[PDB]
Amino acid sequence: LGKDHEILRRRIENGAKELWFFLQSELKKLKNLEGNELQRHADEFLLDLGHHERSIMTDLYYLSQTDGAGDWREKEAKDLTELVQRRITYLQNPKDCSKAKKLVCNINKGCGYGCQLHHVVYCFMIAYGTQRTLILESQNWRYATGGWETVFRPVSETCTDRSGISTGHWSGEVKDKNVQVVELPIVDSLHPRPPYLPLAVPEDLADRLVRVHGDPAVWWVSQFVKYLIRPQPWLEKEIEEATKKLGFKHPVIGVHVRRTEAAFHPIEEYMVHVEEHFQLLARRMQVDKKRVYLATDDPSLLKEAKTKYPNYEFISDNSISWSAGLHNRYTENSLRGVILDIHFLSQADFLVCTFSSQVCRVAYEIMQTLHPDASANFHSLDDIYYFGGQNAHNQIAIYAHQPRTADEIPMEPGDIIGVAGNHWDGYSKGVNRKLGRTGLYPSYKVREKIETVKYPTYPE
Amino acid sequence: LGKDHEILRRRIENGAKELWFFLQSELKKLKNLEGNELQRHADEFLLDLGHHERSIMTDLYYLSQTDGAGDWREKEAKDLTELVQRRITYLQNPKDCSKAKKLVCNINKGCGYGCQLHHVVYCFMIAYGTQRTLILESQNWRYATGGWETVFRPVSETCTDRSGISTGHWSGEVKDKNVQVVELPIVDSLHPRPPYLPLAVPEDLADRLVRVHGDPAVWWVSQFVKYLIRPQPWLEKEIEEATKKLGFKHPVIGVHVRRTEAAFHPIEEYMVHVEEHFQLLARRMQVDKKRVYLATDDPSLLKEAKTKYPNYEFISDNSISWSAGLHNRYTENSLRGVILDIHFLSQADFLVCTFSSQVCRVAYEIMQTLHPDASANFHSLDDIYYFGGQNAHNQIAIYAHQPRTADEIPMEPGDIIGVAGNHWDGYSKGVNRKLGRTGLYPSYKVREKIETVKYPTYPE
């Protein structure tokens, strides 16, 4: 047992006791207060709780690193990656291309860059699940006409061709048992659905993942994003100098505002969490200058942000073409900015965005491959992580709830709870499957139900 | 790295995030509320926070046991005990009694049972520190006239005699270098003070202790209480049947009310913490019937308690003499009840009392020898643990404080803070030694400064 581990463990425990004492004390003061006075007292109270909880989180952070835990987690994540990539790399590059089981994916889905990327990932997952080499059809692609491989490595080194002895539309793995080249439609209408969809995870990989990762579901998706998104050497060198040119430097927080009464929306709502996290980082390292990478479809916002937060240094893709003239010929450059935004977002120490946005989900999924466990490394102003087309996202009720209003669901330990969302206010919304009722419950009383599937193992 | 360890660690971390979300949310609701309505909302809020923090504490508890941590802690505590006791046992029983370095302690100090017991412990600590066999003078002892050894084992098996070639009053270890039998006065006036006092701890034992124990200071004191308090076989058998007769059965909470505007005092104030802990225990085991051992100098209270808390089963030393008539001749039986109260208190799963009370401090010190780490296993309505005559109890400021009123002290990380007390409300009172100022600070912003002394090691 580690010295620091036990010190940290008790300081966490005593930090929460102290918090709880301070809580009931100052809460009993608030009961005897009147408008004006009650205001000042509640904000000071909040101020003070802020720092207090930050001290608990900081201890939890230190605890996650002590007996070489940090190093172990790093070697173990690095490990599972090298593993899953080898497996992918294997499947992708067979010897006899002409005779190899294939699954065919078409890129040009009627939707934005992130949306298409996920469609490939989705084809990719099912390929891997079904033991077929992914073949990627990217001809006349809105972003780079000239093919996917004008921007990123080919998805194969030894089998990029569509051909084969027979060719069906997807009709179920067992039925296509014997079709050498299956053609896969978009998820939206896929009408024998295969088990290989999010948010499940390979049965053979689960123990290891749960041990290393806050959300194996996203970690799994991120393996396919990882393989795909390998850059052509020109893309690499453009990234490096945009890094230089824009000044992008750690520590940085990614903010992504997807635009055109209401509020999960105005800039302040984003910057609330940026400040909180920056405060938190300041407990464990010196923050020289507070850095944000702002990604928006709105040029008016970067001027406003700089005004409202003169504390903060904002950094943005302002670039009006690639670094070398040559390259604007490769890409129809709404794509330049999207590649760079996603890059720099995924690269940041923390990410504040709106998960209902494809782009932000890509940034987060990439992020997962940049650290041992960056599952908790975001704040989204609406959705929890999801993947378009996933099977139902289910939770397990861990403690009893008795509703205090009828807008809330009851539950019992064990209850399967279909979660629609978290409200970032102590409450989540979802369905009590046992009861066929939908309402609020407190987010703490429930626990993530991890889904697994018997994927092919590929022993090489 | 353990599977459960990492699950628990993240659930602790996510439990506090959820708490913090719920906090700022419901706190912003409270700002817009008016008397009547504001009341109901604050109490429901408190109700709900209660359970929420209990879920965090319960996880911390489970975390303290996972990768065999519980077993390890148990073997390691058991170990240090066997060690320190061997060392004590050695020193206490030399071969040549007539020629052995001795230190002489007189029991009949002008104060109650606990008070005298600590005086012995104090002589005992200094004996051990100075490499002298403790000789205990207990002739005409208010509690058992006939000697200490009428109730407890002799403090030695082979050297109970006062004699020797020379005999001084304590005058400093280096000066008494050569006096074979030193005579030690009460602490209150001890005028070359030796390093061997609470709340310091043996330098050779510290790493191990901090690893295993929430408060090595009390653990250390408890080693001497342990050796002392070994019972004569008759005492043992009386305890066993009083256990039977009174129904004393786990789980039980010790409550001790030392009596004869104000309130750290009425029974409700005690039972608030009893309920809270019972609630907490109910998260990790089934509570059949909620059991309290009430120890009071007030016979009117046991009737009242039973009335006010019909939920609870109360258990008390009602006995009007020992089990076997014979034994009332051994002891002047204000002592029967004190031995039993202390016993049953020290034996409980949790202890609510008033630390300004000698008896309760003995119960707590004994408790430390009944489990791997029961340092956090109490709630005192006034003092923190102390030992009468200890050197100054010092803390180290761990985070910055800027005072919001002038009744509060500022501090900087590093500041040595002489702690007078904790107010059990998020705040502690003490002195900023750097600043020679005394006021309140938040209990979380500071950290226990562990004191160590180069004790004799006794390699046997």
PDB file of all heavy atoms in Angstrom, chain A residues 88-112:
ATOM      1  N   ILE A  88      -6.582  -4.079 -36.678  1.00  0.00           N
ATOM      2  CA  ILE A  88      -7.192  -3.319 -37.774  1.00  0.00           C
ATOM      3  C   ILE A  88      -6.271  -3.423 -38.988  1.00  0.00           C
ATOM      4  O   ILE A  88      -6.704  -3.770 -40.098  1.00  0.00           O
ATOM      5  CB  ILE A  88      -7.424  -1.773 -37.443  1.00  0.00           C
ATOM      6  CG1 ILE A  88      -8.496  -1.540 -36.366  1.00  0.00           C
ATOM      7  CG2 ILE A  88      -7.789  -0.973 -38.731  1.00  0.00           C
ATOM      8  CD1 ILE A  88      -8.755  -0.056 -36.037  1.00  0.00           C
ATOM      9  N   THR A  89      -4.996  -3.138 -38.754  1.00  0.00           N
ATOM     10  CA  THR A  89      -3.999  -3.104 -39.798  1.00  0.00           C
ATOM     11  C   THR A  89      -3.960  -4.451 -40.522  1.00  0.00           C
ATOM     12  O   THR A  89      -3.948  -4.504 -41.742  1.00  0.00           O
ATOM     13  CB  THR A  89      -2.655  -2.627 -39.215  1.00  0.00           C
ATOM     14  OG1 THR A  89      -2.675  -1.191 -39.200  1.00  0.00           O
ATOM     15  CG2 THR A  89      -1.453  -3.117 -40.010  1.00  0.00           C
ATOM     16  N   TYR A  90      -4.031  -5.526 -39.757  1.00  0.00           N
ATOM     17  CA  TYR A  90      -4.079  -6.870 -40.268  1.00  0.00           C
ATOM     18  C   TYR A  90      -5.255  -6.990 -41.216  1.00  0.00           C
ATOM     19  O   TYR A  90      -5.071  -7.011 -42.448  1.00  0.00           O
ATOM     20  CB  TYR A  90      -4.181  -7.845 -39.095  1.00  0.00           C
ATOM     21  CG  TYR A  90      -4.382  -9.274 -39.468  1.00  0.00           C
ATOM     22  CD1 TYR A  90      -3.308 -10.098 -39.802  1.00  0.00           C
ATOM     23  CD2 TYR A  90      -5.658  -9.814 -39.480  1.00  0.00           C
ATOM     24  CE1 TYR A  90      -3.516 -11.433 -40.145  1.00  0.00           C
ATOM     25  CE2 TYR A  90      -5.870 -11.127 -39.830  1.00  0.00           C
ATOM     26  CZ  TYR A  90      -4.809 -11.933 -40.148  1.00  0.00           C
ATOM     27  OH  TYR A  90      -5.089 -13.237 -40.473  1.00  0.00           O
ATOM     28  N   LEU A  91      -6.458  -7.032 -40.658  1.00  0.00           N
ATOM     29  CA  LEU A  91      -7.665  -7.122 -41.458  1.00  0.00           C
ATOM     30  C   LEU A  91      -7.650  -6.236 -42.747  1.00  0.00           C
ATOM     31  O   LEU A  91      -8.032  -6.699 -43.822  1.00  0.00           O
ATOM     32  CB  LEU A  91      -8.884  -6.834 -40.593  1.00  0.00           C
ATOM     33  CG  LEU A  91     -10.106  -6.453 -41.409  1.00  0.00           C
ATOM     34  CD1 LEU A  91     -10.773  -7.710 -42.032  1.00  0.00           C
ATOM     35  CD2 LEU A  91     -11.060  -5.585 -40.589  1.00  0.00           C
ATOM     36  N   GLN A  92      -7.185  -4.993 -42.647  1.00  0.00           N
ATOM     37  CA  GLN A  92      -7.188  -4.078 -43.793  1.00  0.00           C
ATOM     38  C   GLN A  92      -6.290  -4.439 -44.998  1.00  0.00           C
ATOM     39  O   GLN A  92      -6.499  -3.934 -46.136  1.00  0.00           O
ATOM     40  CB  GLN A  92      -6.893  -2.638 -43.342  1.00  0.00           C
ATOM     41  CG  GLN A  92      -8.096  -1.938 -42.793  1.00  0.00           C
ATOM     42  CD  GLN A  92      -9.308  -2.073 -43.715  1.00  0.00           C
ATOM     43  OE1 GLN A  92     -10.139  -2.984 -43.563  1.00  0.00           O
ATOM     44  NE2 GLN A  92      -9.397  -1.175 -44.686  1.00  0.00           N
ATOM     45  N   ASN A  93      -5.302  -5.304 -44.768  1.00  0.00           N
ATOM     46  CA  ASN A  93      -4.284  -5.528 -45.796  1.00  0.00           C
ATOM     47  C   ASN A  93      -4.003  -6.976 -46.105  1.00  0.00           C
ATOM     48  O   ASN A  93      -2.926  -7.465 -45.782  1.00  0.00           O
ATOM     49  CB  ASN A  93      -3.004  -4.800 -45.417  1.00  0.00           C
ATOM     50  CG  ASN A  93      -3.178  -3.327 -45.477  1.00  0.00           C
ATOM     51  OD1 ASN A  93      -3.278  -2.778 -46.556  1.00  0.00           O
ATOM     52  ND2 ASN A  93      -3.268  -2.670 -44.318  1.00  0.00           N
ATOM     53  N   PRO A  94      -4.963  -7.667 -46.753  1.00  0.00           N
ATOM     54  CA  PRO A  94      -4.769  -9.088 -46.981  1.00  0.00           C
ATOM     55  C   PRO A  94      -3.836  -9.283 -48.157  1.00  0.00           C
ATOM     56  O   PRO A  94      -3.588  -8.322 -48.909  1.00  0.00           O
ATOM     57  CB  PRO A  94      -6.178  -9.599 -47.329  1.00  0.00           C
ATOM     58  CG  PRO A  94      -7.095  -8.415 -47.171  1.00  0.00           C
ATOM     59  CD  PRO A  94      -6.241  -7.206 -47.317  1.00  0.00           C
ATOM     60  N   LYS A  95      -3.330 -10.516 -48.289  1.00  0.00           N
ATOM     61  CA  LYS A  95      -2.451 -10.923 -49.394  1.00  0.00           C
ATOM     62  C   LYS A  95      -3.178 -10.981 -50.736  1.00  0.00           C
ATOM     63  O   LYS A  95      -2.841 -10.254 -51.678  1.00  0.00           O
ATOM     64  CB  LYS A  95      -1.771 -12.269 -49.106  1.00  0.00           C
ATOM     65  CG  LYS A  95      -0.911 -12.793 -50.267  1.00  0.00           C
ATOM     66  CD  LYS A  95       0.426 -12.054 -50.424  1.00  0.00           C
ATOM     67  CE  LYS A  95       0.409 -10.965 -51.501  1.00  0.00           C
ATOM     68  NZ  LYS A  95      -0.313  -9.688 -51.085  1.00  0.00           N
ATOM     69  N   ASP A  96      -4.183 -11.835 -50.829  1.00  0.00           N
ATOM     70  CA  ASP A  96      -4.921 -11.900 -52.063  1.00  0.00           C
ATOM     71  C   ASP A  96      -6.119 -10.964 -52.030  1.00  0.00           C
ATOM     72  O   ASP A  96      -7.217 -11.335 -51.562  1.00  0.00           O
ATOM     73  CB  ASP A  96      -5.337 -13.330 -52.385  1.00  0.00           C
ATOM     74  CG  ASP A  96      -5.708 -13.501 -53.840  1.00  0.00           C
ATOM     75  OD1 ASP A  96      -5.835 -12.470 -54.554  1.00  0.00           O
ATOM     76  OD2 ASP A  96      -5.868 -14.672 -54.262  1.00  0.00           O
ATOM     77  N   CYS A  97      -5.900  -9.755 -52.540  1.00  0.00           N
ATOM     78  CA  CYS A  97      -6.969  -8.781 -52.600  1.00  0.00           C
ATOM     79  C   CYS A  97      -8.142  -9.312 -53.405  1.00  0.00           C
ATOM     80  O   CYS A  97      -9.294  -9.187 -52.995  1.00  0.00           O
ATOM     81  CB  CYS A  97      -6.512  -7.438 -53.161  1.00  0.00           C
ATOM     82  SG  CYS A  97      -7.900  -6.216 -53.117  1.00  0.00           S
ATOM     83  N   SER A  98      -7.829  -9.921 -54.540  1.00  0.00           N
ATOM     84  CA  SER A  98      -8.839 -10.402 -55.481  1.00  0.00           C
ATOM     85  C   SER A  98      -9.785 -11.421 -54.841  1.00  0.00           C
ATOM     86  O   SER A  98     -10.940 -11.516 -55.239  1.00  0.00           O
ATOM     87  CB  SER A  98      -8.167 -11.003 -56.736  1.00  0.00           C
ATOM     88  OG  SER A  98      -7.091 -10.184 -57.230  1.00  0.00           O
ATOM     89  N   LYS A  99      -9.316 -12.157 -53.836  1.00  0.00           N
ATOM     90  CA  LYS A  99     -10.144 -13.215 -53.256  1.00  0.00           C
ATOM     91  C   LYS A  99     -10.609 -12.968 -51.806  1.00  0.00           C
ATOM     92  O   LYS A  99     -11.183 -13.867 -51.177  1.00  0.00           O
ATOM     93  CB  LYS A  99      -9.468 -14.596 -53.425  1.00  0.00           C
ATOM     94  CG  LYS A  99      -8.498 -15.064 -52.299  1.00  0.00           C
ATOM     95  CD  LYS A  99      -8.271 -16.624 -52.299  1.00  0.00           C
ATOM     96  CE  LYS A  99      -9.599 -17.430 -52.095  1.00  0.00           C
ATOM     97  NZ  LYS A  99      -9.473 -18.893 -52.399  1.00  0.00           N
ATOM     98  N   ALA A 100     -10.374 -11.744 -51.312  1.00  0.00           N
ATOM     99  CA  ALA A 100     -10.596 -11.374 -49.898  1.00  0.00           C
ATOM    100  C   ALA A 100     -12.022 -10.897 -49.603  1.00  0.00           C
ATOM    101  O   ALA A 100     -12.584 -10.130 -50.381  1.00  0.00           O
ATOM    102  CB  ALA A 100      -9.598 -10.305 -49.477  1.00  0.00           C
ATOM    103  N   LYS A 101     -12.599 -11.350 -48.486  1.00  0.00           N
ATOM    104  CA  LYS A 101     -13.931 -10.912 -48.063  1.00  0.00           C
ATOM    105  C   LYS A 101     -13.931  -9.411 -47.857  1.00  0.00           C
ATOM    106  O   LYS A 101     -13.047  -8.878 -47.199  1.00  0.00           O
ATOM    107  CB  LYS A 101     -14.314 -11.595 -46.767  1.00  0.00           C
ATOM    108  CG  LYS A 101     -14.492 -13.066 -46.910  1.00  0.00           C
ATOM    109  CD  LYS A 101     -15.836 -13.398 -47.566  1.00  0.00           C
ATOM    110  CE  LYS A 101     -16.063 -14.914 -47.568  1.00  0.00           C
ATOM    111  NZ  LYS A 101     -14.816 -15.665 -48.033  1.00  0.00           N
ATOM    112  N   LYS A 102     -14.892  -8.718 -48.452  1.00  0.00           N
ATOM    113  CA  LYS A 102     -14.891  -7.264 -48.425  1.00  0.00           C
ATOM    114  C   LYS A 102     -16.251  -6.732 -48.031  1.00  0.00           C
ATOM    115  O   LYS A 102     -17.273  -7.414 -48.148  1.00  0.00           O
ATOM    116  CB  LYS A 102     -14.487  -6.680 -49.786  1.00  0.00           C
ATOM    117  CG  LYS A 102     -13.123  -7.138 -50.293  1.00  0.00           C
ATOM    118  CD  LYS A 102     -12.828  -6.659 -51.734  1.00  0.00           C
ATOM    119  CE  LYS A 102     -11.856  -7.582 -52.479  1.00  0.00           C
ATOM    120  NZ  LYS A 102     -11.154  -6.858 -53.571  1.00  0.00           N
ATOM    121  N   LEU A 103     -16.234  -5.500 -47.547  1.00  0.00           N
ATOM    122  CA  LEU A 103     -17.418  -4.743 -47.248  1.00  0.00           C
ATOM    123  C   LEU A 103     -17.173  -3.349 -47.777  1.00  0.00           C
ATOM    124  O   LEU A 103     -16.084  -2.754 -47.578  1.00  0.00           O
ATOM    125  CB  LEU A 103     -17.690  -4.726 -45.745  1.00  0.00           C
ATOM    126  CG  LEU A 103     -18.683  -3.697 -45.215  1.00  0.00           C
ATOM    127  CD1 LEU A 103     -19.409  -4.274 -44.045  1.00  0.00           C
ATOM    128  CD2 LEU A 103     -17.993  -2.396 -44.827  1.00  0.00           C
ATOM    129  N   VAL A 104     -18.189  -2.825 -48.456  1.00  0.00           N
ATOM    130  CA  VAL A 104     -18.002  -1.634 -49.253  1.00  0.00           C
ATOM    131  C   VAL A 104     -18.788  -0.506 -48.630  1.00  0.00           C
ATOM    132  O   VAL A 104     -19.972  -0.673 -48.264  1.00  0.00           O
ATOM    133  CB  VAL A 104     -18.333  -1.880 -50.781  1.00  0.00           C
ATOM    134  CG1 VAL A 104     -18.072  -0.633 -51.626  1.00  0.00           C
ATOM    135  CG2 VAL A 104     -17.506  -3.033 -51.317  1.00  0.00           C
ATOM    136  N   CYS A 105     -18.091   0.625 -48.506  1.00  0.00           N
ATOM    137  CA  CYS A 105     -18.611   1.820 -47.874  1.00  0.00           C
ATOM    138  C   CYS A 105     -18.476   2.982 -48.834  1.00  0.00           C
ATOM    139  O   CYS A 105     -17.410   3.200 -49.445  1.00  0.00           O
ATOM    140  CB  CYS A 105     -17.855   2.129 -46.554  1.00  0.00           C
ATOM    141  SG  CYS A 105     -18.565   3.486 -45.455  1.00  0.00           S
ATOM    142  N   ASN A 106     -19.559   3.737 -48.953  1.00  0.00           N
ATOM    143  CA  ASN A 106     -19.550   4.923 -49.767  1.00  0.00           C
ATOM    144  C   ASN A 106     -19.573   6.144 -48.894  1.00  0.00           C
ATOM    145  O   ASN A 106     -20.422   6.267 -47.994  1.00  0.00           O
ATOM    146  CB  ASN A 106     -20.750   4.956 -50.720  1.00  0.00           C
ATOM    147  CG  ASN A 106     -20.684   6.131 -51.680  1.00  0.00           C
ATOM    148  OD1 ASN A 106     -21.459   7.081 -51.573  1.00  0.00           O
ATOM    149  ND2 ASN A 106     -19.716   6.086 -52.608  1.00  0.00           N
ATOM    150  N   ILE A 107     -18.667   7.063 -49.205  1.00  0.00           N
ATOM    151  CA  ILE A 107     -18.425   8.205 -48.373  1.00  0.00           C
ATOM    152  C   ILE A 107     -19.468   9.313 -48.518  1.00  0.00           C
ATOM    153  O   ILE A 107     -19.834   9.920 -47.528  1.00  0.00           O
ATOM    154  CB  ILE A 107     -17.001   8.737 -48.569  1.00  0.00           C
ATOM    155  CG1 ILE A 107     -16.462   9.300 -47.244  1.00  0.00           C
ATOM    156  CG2 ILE A 107     -16.949   9.739 -49.703  1.00  0.00           C
ATOM    157  CD1 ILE A 107     -15.146  10.062 -47.339  1.00  0.00           C
ATOM    158  N   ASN A 108     -19.967   9.571 -49.725  1.00  0.00           N
ATOM    159  CA  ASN A 108     -20.696  10.839 -49.986  1.00  0.00           C
ATOM    160  C   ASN A 108     -22.114  10.802 -49.418  1.00  0.00           C
ATOM    161  O   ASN A 108     -23.099  10.755 -50.159  1.00  0.00           O
ATOM    162  CB  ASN A 108     -20.690  11.249 -51.476  1.00  0.00           C
ATOM    163  CG  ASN A 108     -19.542  10.604 -52.271  1.00  0.00           C
ATOM    164  OD1 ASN A 108     -18.493  11.231 -52.508  1.00  0.00           O
ATOM    165  ND2 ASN A 108     -19.731   9.333 -52.674  1.00  0.00           N
ATOM    166  N   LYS A 109     -22.212  10.810 -48.094  1.00  0.00           N
ATOM    167  CA  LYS A 109     -23.512  10.798 -47.432  1.00  0.00           C
ATOM    168  C   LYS A 109     -23.990  12.245 -47.387  1.00  0.00           C
ATOM    169  O   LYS A 109     -23.176  13.166 -47.389  1.00  0.00           O
ATOM    170  CB  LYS A 109     -23.388  10.160 -46.042  1.00  0.00           C
ATOM    171  CG  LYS A 109     -24.679  10.036 -45.245  1.00  0.00           C
ATOM    172  CD  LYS A 109     -24.342   9.672 -43.809  1.00  0.00           C
ATOM    173  CE  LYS A 109     -25.558   9.635 -42.900  1.00  0.00           C
ATOM    174  NZ  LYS A 109     -25.466   8.436 -42.001  1.00  0.00           N
ATOM    175  N   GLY A 110     -25.298  12.455 -47.378  1.00  0.00           N
ATOM    176  CA  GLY A 110     -25.818  13.797 -47.563  1.00  0.00           C
ATOM    177  C   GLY A 110     -25.792  14.568 -46.270  1.00  0.00           C
ATOM    178  O   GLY A 110     -26.826  14.742 -45.637  1.00  0.00           O
ATOM    179  N   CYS A 111     -24.608  15.036 -45.878  1.00  0.00           N
ATOM    180  CA  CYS A 111     -24.395  15.693 -44.573  1.00  0.00           C
ATOM    181  C   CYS A 111     -22.931  16.064 -44.424  1.00  0.00           C
ATOM    182  O   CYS A 111     -22.110  15.647 -45.255  1.00  0.00           O
ATOM    183  CB  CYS A 111     -24.814  14.788 -43.409  1.00  0.00           C
ATOM    184  SG  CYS A 111     -24.021  13.160 -43.445  1.00  0.00           S
ATOM    185  N   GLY A 112     -22.622  16.832 -43.364  1.00  0.00           N
ATOM    186  CA  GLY A 112     -21.320  17.510 -43.218  1.00  0.00           C
ATOM    187  C   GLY A 112     -20.124  16.582 -43.028  1.00  0.00           C
ATOM    188  O   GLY A 112     -20.246  15.339 -43.070  1.00  0.00           O
TER     189      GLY A 112
END
